[PDB]
C-alpha cells in the first residue's frame, strides 16, 4: 500500500538500511515481554503484553535477516516534546541508542513517532527473567538467546538433561559464553550514569530499557535539574542482576594481562595475600554509583546486616585472584630459642584478611592449652610433609603426610540364617508377593573414599540478590523468636557420650573423655575466651559409614576436631537445648512420635488453613551444594541471642572461627590433606538446626518470588494487592527495616502456608485456591529458586502433593501415615517400610545377630517399630508383627531350654510373657506417657 510503503521508507532515515516489515502494515505489533514496574498502583517484575510498537527488521548485502531492528512508536504530543528535550542533552554519549523524531499522517490528522535504530530482539530484562524463572517445559526465549549469540548450536537441545547441573556439567561452559556481553553492558551503564550526572538529569535505571548490545533508551520518566547535579537511581537494576554475574562468570577477562581475553594470564608473586586495593579498584570500575559503603575486610563492618552486604561483593571479587593465596597465614616464632611455624591469621574468600590479636614471638616453656592449639593447627603438619599432586580429583591438593597412600574398603554384612528360615517356614518370600527384600549392606572397593570426596565439585561460587536476602533474613528471624540463648560456663555443659573420637591428630592418644578429664574448668574457660580474639584453624577427617541401605553408593561423615567442638558447645548449647524443649512450634526437633506425638504434630500443622492441600519436596545433593552465603547467614541467625553477653568484635571473631573450622578447612582423606571449597560439614555441633534455618530461608524466598512475579492488575482482592505493592518498596526502595510490615507478612505466611520442619525434611499445608492464582508458592517456584540460588535441578518426581487430609503426608522421616480407630476416637499413627524391618532382622554385624538368645532386646525394639502394621488393610503387612512375636517366644523357650539341659539351672517365666503379647506394644502409641 502507498501508506505502508511510504511509512517504510520514511522509517528508513538518512542511513542506508534495507528494511522488511514484521508482519504488519501501518499498525502496531504486540509481544509478551518482561518488565520491572513501579507506578503507585502496580509493582513487580513480571511478563506483560506490549502493545504500541511497529518493528522492522534489517537486511544485509546477501538478503539475509540480521539481528537489528527499528522500533517505532506512536504517543501523545507532550511525551514527544519531553523525550526530545531530554535526548538532545544525552545524544553525545556512546551508550545511548540513536533516536529519530518525525511526524506522519495516518489520517487527516498528523501523529508523532519516535524511532529507535538498530536494537536487538531481546533486552537485559528478558535474559534475567529467563534465568530466574527456569522451567524446562517452556524455555523458548533462553534457547533463542543461546543460539543467536553462538553459545551453542540448535541441535544441542536434542540431548536430554541438557540443562541439568549434575547430569551434563557441560552446560556451565555454554553459560560462560555470555560473560563478555554482560561485562560490556556494565561498562556502558557506568558511562551512562556519568553522562546523566553531568547533564543534570534525574531518573531510575531499569533492565528493560537496555538491550543486549548495551544501549539505553526510553527517557519518559526522567526529569531535569541544573548541570552537574543529576542523580541516577540504580538499586533494583544491580540487585536483580547479581545472580547472573556468577552464572556467566562475567569477570573472567580481569585475570588477563590487559583485561583482554586474547592475552596470557597475569603472573602474581606467590607471597602476596592482600589484594585490598584490587578489590576497591574493581568496585569503583563496575559499581561506581552504588551508594552504600563497601568494606573489603569485614572486620570493619558495623552490624551483621553490613557483613552480609560486603561479603556478597567479596564472593564475586575473589574469583579473580589466585587460589593459593587463600587460607591460613603463618610466621616463625621462637620457644626457648627453637623456631616453630604457627598460624597468626587467615585470608577468607568472603571475609578478607583477619589478624590474630594475642601473638607473642618470644616465650618460655608453653602450657597445656598452648600445646593443644599448636597440635590442632595444620601449619606444622603441612610444613613438614611432602608435596602432593593427586590427579584422581579436581580439588586443591596440599600435602601428603606419609610416604604411602591408603586404600580403605567396606565389607559385606552377616547373614542371620535362623530368622530367615523361620520366616520362610511361615509363608514369607513367595513369588508374586508384595513384601520382598531391598535393604542390604553394600560393599565398596579401595578407591571409594576419594571418589565420594570428589562430589564437592558441585559447590560453586554464588552471588545473591542482596536486597532480597536482607528482607528474607528479617522474616526468617521471626520464626526463631520464642527461644533464649547466650553463653554458658564450662561447668554447665552436657555431653551425651564421652567415648567417641576426638579427631586428627588427637585420636592418636585417646577418646574425648581423655581431654575432658585432663582439662579443668578454668582451662576450658580460658580456651573459650581465647577464641573471641583469635582464629584457630583445624583439620576434619573423613570416615566411611557401615550401615544398611537401599542404594549402592558409599556414605561418609566428617569427624571434627575436639578443639572446635568444645568451644562451639559453650557458644551454642543453651539455644539448641531451648529449641528441643518446645512443643507446638514450626521446628519439631525434640518431639517424640510415641504416646500420641505424631497425632499432635499433624493437628498442629493442619492449623486452620482454608482450602488445605499437603506438599513435600526434595533437595538434591543438599550438603555438597549449599552456597557459602547461606551457611554464613545461618550462623548469623543463631548468634542473634548474644546481644548482652558478647561484644561486636567478639561476635565477629566467633563467626570467623566457625568459617575457618567447618566451612572451608583442611580435610584429611586417606593420609593426605585437601582444601574444602565450601558446603556444610555434617558432623559439626549445630548441624540439624542450621539445616532448619536454611530450609525455612528457601521456603520464604519461594513465596516472595511467587507473589512479585504476578500481574497485579488481575488480583481481585484489594488487600492482597496492597501487600504486593508494599513488598516491592521494602525490598528495593527502603534501606532500613520496617518492623510493622515484617510482622504483617509473617502473619500472612502463617495463615496460608503452614510448615513443619526437621533438618531439611518438611511438610507444608497450604491454601490451594491462593496457589492457583499465584499468591502462594508452589512446586514450580521451589524449582525456580533452587536453579539460580542453589545450582541444582529438582525433578518433580521426588516431590509429592496430597489433596485429602484424612490421609496424612505421603512421607515424613521415612514414615507413612494412616488414620485408625483407637478406643472411640480416630488418630494418626506412623508406620515403616516392611522391607526395612525384615532387612534389619536378616542382615547384621556378627554377634549382634546370628544368635538371637544373646540379644533378645533387639527384636523387642524391632517389634515396637513394627507394631502399627497390624492396622493395615494389606494382610502381608500384619504378618510382620506376628512373625516378630512368634520369634521372640521361640528365642525365650530356646534360651530357657539350654540352661536346664547342660547346666541344671531352672529359669522362671515371671513377667516375660508380656513380650509375646500385643498389650505391651499397643501402649506405646496411646496418649499417656510412661517412664
Amino acid at each position: 500500500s502507498a501508506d505502508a510503503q511510504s511509512f517504510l521508507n520514511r522509517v528508513c532515515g538518512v542511513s542506508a538500511a534495507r528494511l522488511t516489515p514484521c508482519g504488519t502494515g501501518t499498525s502496531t505489533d504486540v509481544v509478551y515481554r518482561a518488565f520491572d514496574i513501579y507506578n503507585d498502583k502496580v509493582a513487580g517484575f513480571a511478563k506483560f503484553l506490549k502493545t504500541n510498537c511497529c518493528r522492522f527488521q534489517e537486511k544485509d548485502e546477501d538478503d539475509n535477516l540480521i539481528d537489528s531492528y527499528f522500533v517505532v512508536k506512536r504517543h501523545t504530543f507532550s511525551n514527544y516534546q519531553h523525550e526530545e528535550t531530554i535526548y538532545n542533552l544525552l545524544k553525545d554519549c556512546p551508550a545511548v541508542a540513536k533516536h529519530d523524531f518525525f511526524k506522519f499522517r495516518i489520517d487527516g490528522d498528523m501523529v508523532p513517532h519516535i524511532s529507535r535504530q538498530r536494537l536487538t530482539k531481546y533486552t537485559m530484562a528478558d535474559l534475567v527473567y529467563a534465568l530466574r524463572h527456569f522451567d524446562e517445559g517452556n524455555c523458548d526465549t533462553l534457547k533463542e538467546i543461546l543460539v543467536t549469540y553462538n553459545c551453542c548450536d540448535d541441535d544441542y537441545f536434542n540431548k536430554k538433561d541438557w540443562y541439568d547441573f549434575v547430569e551434563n556439567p557441560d552446560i556451565l561452559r555454554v553459560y560462560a559464553n555470555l560473560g563478555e556481553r554482560v561485562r560490556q553492558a556494565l561498562l556502558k551503564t557506568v558511562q551512562f550514569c556519568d553522562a546523566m550526572r553531568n547533564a543534570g538529569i534525574v531518573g531510575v535505571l531499569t533492565l528493560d530499557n537496555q538491550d543486549l548490545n548495551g544501549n539505553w533508551y526510553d527517557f519518559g520518566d526522567f526529569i531535569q535539574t541544573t548541570p552537574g547535579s543529576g542523580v541516577p537511581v540504580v538499586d533494583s537494576y544491580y540487585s536483580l542482576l547479581m545472580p547472573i554475574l556468577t552464572l556467566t562468570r562475567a569477570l573472567t577477562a580481569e585475570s588477563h594481562v590487559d583485561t583482554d581475553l586474547t592475552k596470557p594470564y597475569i603472573k602474581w608473586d606467590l607471597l602476596k595475600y592482600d589484594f585490598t586495593e584490587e578489590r576497591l579498584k574493581l568496585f569503583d570500575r563496575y559499581f561506581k554509583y552504588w551508594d552504600q559503603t563497601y568494606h573489603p575486610n569485614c572486620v570493619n563492618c558495623l552490624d551483621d546486616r553490613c557483613i552480609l552486604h560486603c561479603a556478597n561483593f567479596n564472593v564475586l571479587f575473589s574469583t579473580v585472584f589466585p587460589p593459593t593465596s587463600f587460607g591460613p597465614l603463618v610466621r616463625k616464632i621462637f620457644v626457648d630459642g627453637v623456631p616453630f611455624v604457627v598460624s597468626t591469621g587467615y585470608h577468607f574468600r568472603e571475609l578478607g584478611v583477619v589478624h590474630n590479636q594475642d601473638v607473642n614471638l618470644h616465650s618460655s616453656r608453653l602450657s597445656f592449652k598452648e600445646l593443644l592449639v599448636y597440635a590442632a593447627d595444620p601449619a606444622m603438619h603441612a610444613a613438614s610433609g611432602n608435596l602432593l599432586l593427586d590427579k584422581r580429583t579436581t580439588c586443591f591438593s596440599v600435602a601428603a603426610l606419609t610416604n604411602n597412600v591408603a586404600f580403605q574398603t567396606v565389607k559385606p554384612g552377616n547373614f542371620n540364617k535362623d530368622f530367615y528360615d523361620f520366616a520362610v517356614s511361615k509363608g514369607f518370600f513367595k513369588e508374586g508377593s508384595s513384601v520382598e527384600l531391598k535393604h542390604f549392606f553394600f560393599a565398596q572397593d579401595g578407591n571409594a573414599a576419594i571418589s565420594d570426596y570428589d562430589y564437592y565439585r558441585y559447590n560453586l561460587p554464588t552471588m545473591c540478590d542482596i536486597r532480597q536476602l536482607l528482607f528474607v533474613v528479617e522474616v526468617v528471624d521471626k520464626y526463631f523468636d520464642c527461644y533464649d540463648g547466650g553463653c554458658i560456663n564450662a561447668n554447665q555443659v552436657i555431653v551425651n557420650n564421652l567415648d567417641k573420637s576426638a579427631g586428627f591428630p588427637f585420636n592418636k592418644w585417646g577418646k574425648a573423655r581423655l581431654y575432658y578429664d585432663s582439662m579443668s574448668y578454668e582451662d576450658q574457660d580460658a580456651l573459650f575466651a581465647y577464641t573471641k580474639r583469635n582464629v584457630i584453624p583445624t583439620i576434619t577427617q573423613m570416615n566411611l559409614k557401615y550401615a544398611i541401605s537401599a542404594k549402592n553408593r558409599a556414605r561418609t561423615v566428617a569427624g571434627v576436631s575436639i578443639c572446635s567442638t568444645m568451644t562451639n558447645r559453650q557458644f551454642h548449647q543453651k539455644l539448641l537445648k531451648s529449641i528441643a524443649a518446645t512443643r507446638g512450634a514450626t521446628v519439631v526437633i525434640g518431639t517424640s512420635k510415641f504416646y500420641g506425638g505424631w497425632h499432635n504434630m499433624l493437628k498442629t500443622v493442619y492449623s486452620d488453613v482454608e482450602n488445605p492441600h499437603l506438599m513435600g519436596w526434595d533437595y538434591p545433593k543438599c550438603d555438597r551444594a549449599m552456597p557459602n552465603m547461606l551457611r554464613i547467614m545461618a550462623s548469623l541467625v543463631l548468634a542473634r541471642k548474644h546481644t548482652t553477653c558478647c561484644s561486636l568484635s567478639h561476635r565477629f571473631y566467633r563467626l570467623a572461627n566457625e568459617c575457618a573450622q567447618v566451612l572451608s578447612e583442611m580435610v584429611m582423606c586417606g593420609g593426605s590433606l585437601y582444601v574444602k571449597p565450601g558446603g556444610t560439614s555434617s558432623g559439626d555441633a549445630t548441624t540439624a538446626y542450621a539445616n532448619s534455618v536454611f530450609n525455612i530461608c528457601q521456603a520464604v524466598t519461594a513465596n516472595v518470588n511467587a507473589l512479585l512475579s504476578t500481574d497485579g492488575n488481575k488480583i481481585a482482592d484489594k488487600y492482597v494487592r496492597n501487600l504486593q505493592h508494599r513488598l516491592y518498596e521494602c525490598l528495593y526502595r527502603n534501606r532500613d527495616v520496617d518492623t510493622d510490615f515484617v510482622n504483617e507478612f509473617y502473619a500472612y505466611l502463617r495463615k496460608h502456608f503452614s510448615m513443619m520442619i526437621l533438618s531439611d525434611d518438611a511438610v507444608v499445608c497450604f491454601n490451594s485456591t491462593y496457589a492457583s492464582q499465584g499468591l502462594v508458592a508452589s512446586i514450580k517456584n521451589f524449582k525456580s529458586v533452587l536453579y539460580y540460588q542453589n545450582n541444582v535441578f529438582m525433578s518433580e518426581a521426588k516431590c509429592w502433593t496430597e489433596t485429602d487430609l484424612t490421609k496424612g503426608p505421603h512421607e515424613f522421616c521415612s514414615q507413612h501415615t494412616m488414620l485408625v480407630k483407637q478406643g472411640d476416637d480416630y488418630v494418626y499413627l506412623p508406620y515403616p517400610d516392611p522391607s526395612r524391618i525384615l532387612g534389619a532382622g536378616c542382615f547384621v554385624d556378627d554377634i549382634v545377630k546370628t544368635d538371637g538368645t544373646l540379644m533378645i532386646e533387639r527384636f523387642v525394639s524391632l517389634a515396637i517399630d513394627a507394631y502399627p502394621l497390624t492396622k493395615h488393610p494389606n494382610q502381608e503387612y500384619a504378618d510382620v508383627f506376628h512373625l516378630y512375636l512368634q520369634y521372640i517366644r521361640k528365642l525365650h523357650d530356646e534360651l530357657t531350654g539350654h540352661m536346664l539341659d547342660m547346666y541344671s539351672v531352672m529359669l522362671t517365666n515371671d513377667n516375660t510373657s508380656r513380650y509375646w503379647e500385643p498389650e505391651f506394644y499397643e501402649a506405646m502409641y496411646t496418649p499417656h506417657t510412661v517412664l
Binding site: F35, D36, I37, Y38, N39, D40, V202, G203, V204, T206, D221, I223, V233
Partner: peptide, 7 residues
C-alpha cells in the same frame, strides 16, 4: 514504567 515519586 518506573517512577521517582508516585505520591
Amino acid at each position: 514504567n518506573n517512577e521517582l515519586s508516585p505520591v
